[model samples]
Target: HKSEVAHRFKDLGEENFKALVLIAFAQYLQQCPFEDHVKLVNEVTEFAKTCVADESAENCDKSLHTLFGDKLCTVATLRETYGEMADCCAKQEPERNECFLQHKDDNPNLPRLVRPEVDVMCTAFHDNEETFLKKYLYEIARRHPYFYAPELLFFAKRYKAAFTECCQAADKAACLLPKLDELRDEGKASSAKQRLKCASLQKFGERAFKAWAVARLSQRFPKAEFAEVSKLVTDLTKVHTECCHGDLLECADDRADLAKYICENQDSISSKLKECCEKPLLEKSHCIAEVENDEMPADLPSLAADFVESKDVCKNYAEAKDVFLGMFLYEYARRHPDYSVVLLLRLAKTYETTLEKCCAAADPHECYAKVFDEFKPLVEEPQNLIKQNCELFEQLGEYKFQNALLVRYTKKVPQVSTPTLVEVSRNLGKVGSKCCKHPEAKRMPCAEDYLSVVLNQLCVLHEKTPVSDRVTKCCTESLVNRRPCFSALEVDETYVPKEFNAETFTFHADICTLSEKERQIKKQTALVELVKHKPKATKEQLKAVMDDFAAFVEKCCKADDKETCFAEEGKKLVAASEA
Candidate 1:
């Protein structure tokens, strides 16, 4: 307002000026810089204070000029819009009340008619607060996508925090949401005379908000919630169109058809464009044309390939010194690197072990690629993680096999006979298994995924724990491919005291397993190479493969249930001893 006291006027004499000021200020403040917020806030605050001491005719000229001068009340209108926004963002409810109290006399009868506008403005403002929270969520997710990775145990955890907060907040504003719904309904029902205004206000508001929310949601939750959110936009759009416009159902079974569609796809309301897009023939042809000229975008997560066919370059990763080398070497290079030389290597090993045990009839190469690409990246990368896990195997030898087994043999035999190394190995396996399942561990390879991975995680965990009682030498060599060779037999000699050649039976079993470490390594290497260019598979598929492989191992470990011996009929040695 030119006079800077437009809203301060006390009488009806300033009414015309005040209206213009209100409209002008609204327009002006809409486009003002946010950095000027504090200055503008102070000015508004002072203006409110003006009403406290003076509401007289003496301020009329000043108020009228500033309120609706030659600028079409531009300054006052801008101030009015800003004032309303301030009221919405105000810290204290009483402060907002006090603000409105100053302008109470301007119309004295304005509250009822203006309430709708005020309600819509404020509810929409706060409803959109999630926009800010969603932004933060996206930023955090971009930094730590692992936390929200597909099939990650914590995906829901991270998402629920923000999503539930906004959902609950929106629910609490029940009255406001209904007003919006009513406005939308009126727009749909309006006649042609008022159609343009009704449509502009209701239809445009919904469309604008929908578009804004979708864009925000994608930036924040992106791949995780994209499908559902996009679908929601489409569903809401359809419902809004049909209901707002009050279009007649064309089909005799319109309600039934609508019900069926809604029932089948209710959850699809929030889907994204990417998720809902159809690959039409024309679009496919266009894509082919674009691809021939190298204009098509690279598609990540090629779901149909059944195998990883190509790799993405890790950009700007040059000059590797002073990097987080442990992660790079152990995780990035050997696990889930964007360019996956290492993934292929590790995948191959899983395939070899899986295939050797299965001995089933499948195309070896095809099966290997299928299984390896599915499980390799997962088995390799560690999440709920720490640094320096690989060292677990290196230090296993530091633990003495005898000392760690002092209580064995019921304390009857010397501790040296208990074999502590084997005991530690078993315990380590159990610990790793438990750790990997931890909610905090969050699918990251803990110290126990494999002997090596488990050792590495434990080493990192050990560093943080007090007393540092950590395994020194990781007994990888002792464990891999080696089975404790032994024979088993039941003796009947307990019943035959000092009787030579009475009767005897001897049956034996040895563990069937790998003998050479080098061979196992080579097998692992071959599997890994074959797994290169393999697709990153889903978690369920990976789990299934592991289950199958374990079943195979269990079969090999099983032994005959019974053994029998009988004296030859022609030979009488057993019968002579039978005496």
Candidate 2:
């Protein structure tokens, strides 16, 4: 292994001479960068290769035996020499000069075209496809700069028109009538704020859409009964609610209708925005208080004087409508892949969450209704005021935003220092830049069979460190990724069982009004479903869902008598799942 070890000479003269030669050789190579010098070294190295290859050159055979012995240097030297010869040949060739220069500069724009390589590398789990969502999807949406291109403006307006039509159809569907009737003062006996918030936020535009629908119905069927119009509203609301929560049939209808409308109308919408919305915000006069030492309105802040506010500011005014609609529409696309819904829904959800975060931050004391009032008038019917306002937002065009709707609305998790181990585990995917886009995709084992993955990630944390919230966070997030796993088991098919649907993460829509018994039932079902559906269960995932569900039940349950009953019921479900 010691290929060359020159023993030190006992005499000082010999030892000094050997050291000087080694130093001189190193310095000799330092400034030798020219082609002739490189070629000379290459020639000498190749001559050595030939000596080793011929096997019969003077003392070469014996020298080779001393250097490499029985090793196959012939094949190695041939490959090694061939590459050097080819390189020297290519550099000097006149005919290939153009080709060589072009190759280096050809890829200057290559960096811009790069996309996520996950689709290319891992195809087995299909890029871990099942309902994949980024918690930062809203963050990306808000922060990503929107281009002022004519094409993008068109996409925004196309979605708006499609959303408008959907709102109109939803108004006529009949299911909404029952929900609307239940919402009134005498019907459900709700409070003032709830009534105002629900009406001001949800119904303003819904009413507008309803009026449009009613007008269409009158023209189409002049002799039809008006009572049937109420019935249609009821049916439509039911479909809207069903589709809102990922119900298959409702999802299908909303998507198909939106897609057909968007595709046909997209170009026209694009033309309008190009023709109208792109006009720059104009400077306008303002009545400013005359400052004591200042002349005319020059005393006013520059913003109120010569500086122009953006006409696109009307866009900000129109944001909330788009944001909520984006959420509902995207939620629709999660189950149904209508192109119009897919495009609009993604943009909308991103826009909605971005707007929510913005509104939440900008005005802490304000109610969502205050925001809804701006566009609520665009929708004309009483019952559909809320729905139409939301739809009008969709009509405002899909916006490319600088800040996302959700990030602005929700409290963001900060970067950890001495943070709890649970958050670290939950954000495991964010460990590096490469995995940031789809951090959850790195390991499909958990995604393919979530229970197994959750259990594995949990065992790792518990075994490596003392487990608590970190274990719970990772496991629950994994469970959410599993999608309707528990719910699928609960569905009886024949009966629309009001049982708990477990697989996906549970979200509350409007739960404060439910009775204590109903709340308990909801809790018990959620608890049972979570426990039963996991591929492999950790004590933490099971415990977290139970604790959270119990908290939900307690918070929403109105009957004092049913509290203890529900507690006992929850314990049983927890125990059963553990078993």
Candidate 3:
């Protein structure tokens, strides 16, 4: 079969042989400036046609074949031999030009743009379209920087074909081709006059590809609630179009840069999603932002490896690495005493392994890579991991160590009359001063243990318990206690003030005093008066007028901004009645 193929190749003569080579070389040709690639192909085509007509010439110009042989013939071989092609993929005009020119002698099997296991990817794209689209775009952005505008459109079209074949869709090609052609035509017009920079080509490709993908998704995930998905798509496209104006992949050093871009613009992205998708589909709205988060995990291996290499600095100090790592672990556990011993132990073990294996290694990076290769699976899922165990530890700490005692005393002989409430509230000031004098609330295990004992005593104290023995000596303990002390009695004024703030202490206390029905009635009374007096108001006028009055009452009534929870409903009632 090899002999037969070689004979067939020879019989086809120079033109067909060169054509075959150029066809194979097309993907690599994309790495060159599109205008230059186009010029080369055009020169080859014109000569091939003209040479056939002018048979009188004794020597056919086989010079074009030599050029084709240099650039095209060994493309597959060159890509295999020289990894420098990958470096050029993400670079700009002069640098990218230098990369290709310098490596012109390398054997030239063009680098693979599409993944090797494309069939498996096709299956994934069929099964989960959105995830596959994200994966596909990211792969192209990361690996296929060789594309110029027209070449990018070429790949876009190939992907479209793949999409149609995998999904067995009839109109998918029709939907896809026009978008790609617009990009292709735009490229042709721009490049006809002057060569487009590789950076500009990448931007065009990224923008066009993203726009095409988003359109496809919009069709698949149509939602009546958010007709503005297209608008969001436009905004995102516009933002991405303007990003990395120099070189998209060059400016984007790694996955972290991509993650930062999404995170830094989270407010803009989130606000748009909130306006577009209904509340239930909030997760769907965040799909792209989540893509950024997903890439962050892929960096863990590199970070672990780099962290191990930093141990080189400790070599000069001999035992410095061990001492530093030990101190760090101990201090971290002390600061978060709420964390379970088991969780803290796992952390200690992880760092200790780093000290033993990584710091002692001839190549710490290799040791780190091996450690994390095993470590990742244990930590990836939070369910059985340190995060979940620590969260449970904190929850129990809050319940058993704090809330249980505070709730009991406040509810047991709860203040009934206004004076009793005042008395309890005033007395709470003394308890706070006694329990929370030091700032080590949960930083030290001993502190938490001590506070728990103090809390148990406070929970059981009664009116008959003498003021002299009690932390509070009398009703005239402090001047602030004279006005209204119900707020203080309502919470561990000590715990709430330190854990949160004074404003939170007052708000929770006031909220505890009123029934939900009583609160609603008060809001309704205030809202009705505001609306009746502002009969000539428009929607904006009514909303502002009512909002200001409602905010004042809610704040005065110890309602936070959540005053709108019930107050907004009152405005609706007034609007309905007035109508």
Candidate 4:
């Protein structure tokens, strides 16, 4: 008899009426320990009274009747299932609200129930409503022999209000009626309209989706919170609206194009992108894309290039120089915009290794060209044209490591003989101009190492034998391997005139070199003379004199006055011995 009342609960409106059944079922569960049928019914009724405290007893009675009014007490088996469903539904806000409200009568003035709300309610109650519905209908069919309930409109009166409240991709109501018609032929009710309504409610969720989405994301990134993420989401949403037409889901193609554009014009957002997203660089890009639209574009090499190119935006790659290979690959990407950045870098690496093994200073361009040609399209631009490309969106435009090296060498190297020094300086500038003049040099074998070799050779020649045949030979030998090296020096015979020997032109006596043994004898002789002059010196004072003698010896070791080494050391030792 209680089964009859449970089945009769379906007589209520198709939609909210089902919600009414769910509510009654929830209260029935609350009273589950009562095995006596009358006591169980009384408990549910008393619970309903508490749920609607301000309402009259008659209203509460009417609500209970609407849900379970068929002249039958609560059944033990039904109460157990209803109790379990209630507990499960109460676990989530949507379902909890649905079950809790079931105890009260439907108030027409209350905001029309949405499909999403109803869907959750059904899910909590049956877990699998369609299958459960079919099973129930089949069991009843066996008993009735010809049981039938045609296209049962759950809440026909509330359809307009629910339809108006629910948002969806299209008018799902039209789709709903047909499915209901099909299910009705089998004496089972259709959940078609209900499902569409649920979908519509989910779409409506977009209103709060940004906040909700950030909250979900925050669960994974606990340090980040809803308020902060909400602001970023808002900014990204505006960008989406401006660049992707405000509907990320609807404007799929446009959003993709915008992602590409963002990569290309990363400076447009700059630090804001990273400050908001945090990065392996592309994380910011992805977050922006998701906030604007829900797309995780393929992380191809071209994408990496964009990531590196926008290092200033990400701040994660602050030490770009430290990541030489990555920086070099980034340069390659700039030179060949259409090529995938990763492929270009990989090919460039192969070229670099090949050059290291086989390239000759005599003709590196030829060596480079050969290896480059072998790589062919793998290292080439999309159309093999010199297209103007942005470097880090112009933040680090046209930088060349070789140019920096050259500048440093010029400043730090010795400048002894004016003519030789001037020539060397000029050559260094010429080498830099040839090897690092344009941004494209990043794609080629740098002349930096070769030029450094030539520089060292020139410095050695100028220091050891200026204006000699050795200097001319050094320049001559360096020309084949590094022609630009000669440009730094002036090698004209007239450049350092034959009269350039300093001694021949000087009026003063020149310092002479001393033989090692002769100098040591002179040092001993001078020390003996100092000891005679300071005979009264204490043994401790003589040790101090010895220390001074060692200091003098070191200072005068390379003196131009050849006699000074021994003279200075012996004189200091004698003075201290006397003191």
Q: Which ten residues in a row have the lowest lDDT in candidate 1?
A: 480-489
Tens-digit per-residue lDDT, 1-579, candidate 2: 111111111211232322222221112222222232334433434444444345344544333123221121122332353333223223323323222222221112212222233323123123432111111111111221121112122232333333233334534324333332323212111122212222322433554334323332222222223444334434444444433332222343443343333224423212212222222221000010000111122222322111113333324445655333422332322222211211222233343454456545554223232333432332122113223323433442222110111111111211111122232222222221112223232222112222233334433444556434433344343222222222122212232222344333343433456754454344433333343244244446655655666554554354565554444554544444444
Query: What TM-score do all the candidates reach, one by one?
Result: 0.16, 0.16, 0.18, 0.18
Instruction: Identify the superior model by TM-score, candidate 2 or candidate 4.
Output: 4
Candidate 4: tens digits of C-alpha lDDT, residues 1-579:
223222222332233334333323323333333224335344544544443454333434343333343222235353354454434342434344344434322112223223343444344324644333332332322222211112122222223233233323165545444444333322211232222223323443443333323322322222223344344445444443332221212233343444444445434323234343443221334455334211121232442344323434223333442234333443344344333323444454564565455433455444444544556754453223222222212332222222222222222222234334434443444344444444563323234333444455464556566544434454445222223333334423232212222222111111224544344334333333333233333446755665665566555654565454555454444332445
Better of 3 and 4 by lDDT: 3
Q: What stretches of model 4 exceed 4 Å from their correct place?
A: 1-324, 359-365, 369-372, 379-579
lDDT to native, each model: 0.31, 0.30, 0.38, 0.36
Question: Compared with the true structure, what per-residue lDDT tens digits does model 1 show for residues 1-579?
Answer: 323353333322243222222222322233333323334434544454465345443443343223222232233433554455344233334343234223322112212222234344445435763333333223332222212111121232333342344344545346444444444323222222122222433634654434433432222222223445455445444543443332211111232343344335523422322322233211221222112111112243342232222221111122331121212222222122222222222343343354444334344334334553556444434331222222342343322211112112112211111122233333443444344344432223222223333333333343444221113222121222111110011222222222223222111122234434333233222222212112132235533542443333344335343112111211222222121
lDDT of 3 by residue, 1-579 (tens): 223223323444554434333333443443443334335544655554454555333334333323334444334434554466655645545555445544433234445544434455556767876445533443342233333322343344466565656345455445544544445334333332112223333634654333332432232222311223344445554444433242222222232243344345544333333332332211232334322111011121233323445546336225555334433333333333333223333454575566576657687546654544454543343223323324333454422222222223333223222233333332333223333343333222222233222322332353345322222422323211211222234323222111212221112224436865455434333332232233233556655654554554455445454545434543444443333
Model 3: pairs clashing at backbone N, Cα or C within 3 Å: 74-108, 74-109, 75-108, 75-109, 75-110, 76-108, 76-109, 77-109, 78-107, 78-108
Better of 2 and 4 by lDDT: 4
Hey, what RMSD does candidate 3 come out at? 26.3
Ten-residue region with minimum lDDT total, candidate 3:
291-300
Question: What is the model-wide C-alpha lDDT for candidate 3?
Answer: 0.38
> Which pairs clash (backbone N, Cα, C closer than 3 Å) in model 4?
13-154, 14-154, 14-155, 15-154, 23-102, 423-488, 423-489, 426-488, 427-487, 427-488
Model 2 has how many clashing residue pairs? Answer: 66
**What lDDT is obtained when candidate 4 is compared to the true structure?**
0.36
